[PDB]
Write a protein that binds this ligand. Structure first.
Ligand SMILES: [Cl-]
Ligand SMILES: [Cl-]
Ligand code: NI
Length: 405
């Protein structure tokens, strides 16, 4: 009676299989993991073995559980924390998560007898990818190099509000042949402890660090940002030299809460108003409307002058984003480019998808503490639809950077 995992990194699909069951036996499968602070994540699903007493998750549908239907990776993407408002993250990329898998007898709520167990390590630092902390000038970052002679096409990776240095996107990208820089800009070592001003000179220095590194191919670098990071990536593309291609995931394309400055140019903030928060029946807060109206549309003074960018731009949007109206913004950015005689950016819009489009099989966190506001907010997204968005967006990003870098 045995559990098989064929043929490995968190974002890679795997085939889960069970041999040695009774013919057409009713079983529950359960998956579990403790994250880096000891918080528990779990998921389960009910199945029936076939006539040979075999179960194959790529062919047999879940009849119920944390999800239902033909979902081979569901036991991983549907994982939910015990503790509410707790988000699935990876802070130490060099240590894997261990997933405990278990096959239990029956479909009963009170779990049946243990038929088998298996522990599989899921990785965030792919095979032979080398990691190095970067302290160069004021730049605080981490560099990931693929294995091989090199040099490699280079990408800089920028998160939104939250601060610190999260590496997990850059480490996984490094597994596809890109040198990648995870870049911190506040709330990390000696960097400022806040976000009162975005000064682009800091990010220019990170570009310069990358383009001068012996293992970074060039002539330009790729930029990948989410949220405020996406906006910073669009600003960098608009103002700096040697940016070859830019991907924005749920960016806004405007200076929002804080001015964007570079040398003798400043983009004024549009501002927000907290009276525009909406409290759901549940008590959750929805901030999607707090920002001031983008009057004039693409002519609005708060617009990042993205017509200045020399390279191509890809905009990725969660249609169910509750942090802000990423879909509306992406169109306006498109309208801005077209009006100054540039090519339409590529826009990919994902239905049922929220603000936080993570790498593949990262479980959705529907709501958590918003750090500025000190209240629990919804982020948007439905688990199944969000999960397919995260799988597809990864491939779109790889294809885009492959082509342009
Ligand atoms: Cl489902
Ligand atoms: Cl922000
Ligand atoms: Ni409600």
């Amino acid at each position: 009676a045995t559990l098989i995992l064929e043929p490995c990194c968190w974002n890679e699909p795997v085939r889960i299989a069970v041999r040695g069951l009774a013919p057409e036996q009713r079983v529950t499968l359960r998956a579990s993991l403790r994250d880096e602070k000891g918080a528990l994540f779990r998921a389960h699903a009910r199945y029936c073995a076939d006539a040979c007493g075999e179960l194959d998750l790529e062919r047999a549908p879940a009849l119920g559980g944390s999800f239902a239907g033909l979902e081979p990776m569901g036991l991983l993407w549907a994982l939910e924390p015990e503790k509410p408002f707790w988000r699935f993250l990876k802070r130490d990329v060099q240590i894997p998560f261990v997933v405990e898998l278990e096959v239990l007898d029956g479909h009963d709520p009170e779990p049946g007898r243990l038929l088998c167990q298996a522990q599989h390590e899921r990785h965030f630092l792919p095979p032979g990818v080398w990691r190095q902390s970067v302290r160069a000038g004021r730049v605080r970052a981490t560099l990931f190099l693929p294995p091989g002679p090199g040099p490699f096409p280079g990408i800089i990776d920028i998160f939104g509000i939250g601060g610190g240095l999260l590496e997990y996107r850059a480490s996984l990208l490094a597994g596809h042949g890109f040198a990648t820089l995870a870049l911190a800009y506040y709330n990390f070592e000696d960097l400022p402890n806040n976000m009162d001003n975005i000064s682009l000179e800091y990010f220019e220095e990170a570009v310069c660090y990358m383009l001068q590194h012996p293992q970074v191919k060039g002539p330009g670098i790729g930029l990948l940002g989410i949220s405020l990071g996406a906006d910073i990536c669009l600003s960098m593309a608009s103002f700096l030299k040697n940016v070859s291609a830019t991907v924005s995931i749920n960016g806004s394309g405007i200076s929002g809460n804080t001015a964007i400055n570079y040398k003798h140019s400043s983009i004024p903030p549009l501002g927000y108003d907290l009276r525009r928060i909406k409290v759901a029946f549940s008590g959750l807060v929805d901030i999607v409307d707090i920002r001031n109206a983008l009057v004039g549309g693409y002519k609005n003074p708060s617009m990042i002058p993205i017509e200045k960018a020399q390279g191509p731009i890809l905009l990725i949007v969660g249609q169910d984003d509750h942090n802000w109206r990423s879909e509306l913004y992406a169109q306006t950015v498109s309208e801005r480019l077209q009006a100054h005689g540039k090519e339409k950016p590529q826009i990919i819009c994902y239905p049922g998808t929220g603000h936080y489009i993570e790498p593949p099989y990262f479980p959705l966190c529907p709501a958590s503490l918003h750090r500025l506001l000190n209240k629990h907010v919804i982020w948007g997204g439905e688990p199944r639809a969000h999960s397919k968005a995260q799988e597809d967006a990864w491939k779109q990003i790889l294809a885009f950077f492959c082509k342009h870098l």
